[PDB]
Amino acid sequence: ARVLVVDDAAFMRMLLKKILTQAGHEVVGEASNGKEAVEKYKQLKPDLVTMDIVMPEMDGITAVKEIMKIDPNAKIIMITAVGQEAKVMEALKSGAKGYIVKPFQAQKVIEEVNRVL
Amino acid sequence: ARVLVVDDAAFMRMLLKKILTQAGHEVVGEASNGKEAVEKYKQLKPDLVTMDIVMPEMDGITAVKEIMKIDPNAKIIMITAVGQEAKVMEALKSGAKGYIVKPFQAQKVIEEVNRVL
């Protein structure tokens, strides 16, 4: 009777939580995506999961492409950590204008925002 | 100076919003994933986007697989609409126990939760 509700739409989570709780079940957790669903399953060990078969599955690169398609003047800065450089490379190829590296130093972040503008 | 901040981690959004606002910039919106980033770009037409190159990119099927890997007794119900049947099929193959169809009738939803338990 302990249920993990997974859905990218907050209102869908709510609607399902309503129906479950109204049937005497306890929603012990919620997730907006795949990774979070799996993490929350470990931590909560629920009896039941409800999961939308559509989950956000758009990466940073293709979201750059979609935004550039909409507005070719879009100014995008990627947030990256060490190890993701191949993907950042391709984001920049696809129209992104810059990037900043985690962990942030506030000065370097604004140097880069300013540079882009 | 109007910035759309995109990152799957709420605290990362916050941290970046802090640094931007402290530099005299207006965070006019936020997104937790790819789809939402693109939608919000249209609606807000921001001067600047900041976007994590890692965005949730795990689909419902592979999140079923990861959960089954963790607990082979996991009980998962897929939420589906018309048109997604190929993906629901494969979710069930990978260990999911059932599904419910949107738009929900509360009775059919609990018939299916009960059946699974």
Author numbering:
A (entry chain A), B (entry chain A): 2 to 118
Sentences from the paper on this structure:
Here, we present single-crystal X-ray structures of CheY from Pyrococcus horikoshii (PhCheY) in two different crystal forms, and the protein purification, crystallization and X-ray data collection of CheF (PhCheF). CheA autophosphorylates and subsequently donates the phosphate to CheY, yielding phosphorylated CheY. The concentration of CheY-P determines the switching frequency of the flagellum or archaellum, respectively. We observe PhCheY to have a domain-swapped, pseudo-dimeric fold, which may reflect inherent properties of the protein fold but is not likely to be of physiological relevance.
In striking contrast to all of the known CheY structures, PhCheY adopts an open conformation in both crystal forms, with the two subdomains of a given subunit directed away from one another. In both of the two PhCheY structures solved in this study, two polypeptide chains assemble by pairing the N-terminal subdomain of a chain with the C-terminal subdomain of the other chain; i.e. the α3/β4/α4/β5/α5 part of the fold of each subunit packs with the β1/α1/β2/α2 part of the other subunit [Fig. 1(a)]. The crystal form with space group P2 contains three non­crystallographic symmetry (NCS) molecules in the asymmetric unit. Superposition of the three subunits shows differing orientations between the domains, leading to an inter-domain movement of up to 90° [Fig. 1(b)]. T. maritima CheY and PhCheY superimpose well, with the main deviation in the connecting region composed of the short helical segment of the β3–α3 loop. This region is unwound in the PhCheY structure (residues 54–60) [Fig. 1(c)], facilitating the inter-domain movement. In all cases, the rotational movement of the C-terminal domain was calculated after the initial superposition of the N-terminal domain. The connecting region between the β3–α3 loop is partially disordered for the two subunits C and E. For both crystal forms an unambiguous trace of the electron density in the β3–α3 loop was verified by a feature-enhanced map (FEM; Afonine et al., 2015; shown in Supplementary Fig. S2 for the P2 crystal form). Owing to a putative cold-induced destabilization of PhCheY (P. horikoshii grows at 98°C), and putatively further induced by the crystallization conditions, the PhCheY fold disassembles into an open subdomain-dissociated conformation. At the high protein concentration in the crystallization drop, PhCheY can then reassemble from this open state with a partner polypeptide to form a domain-swapped dimeric assembly that is eventually removed from the monomer–dimer equilibrium by crystallization.
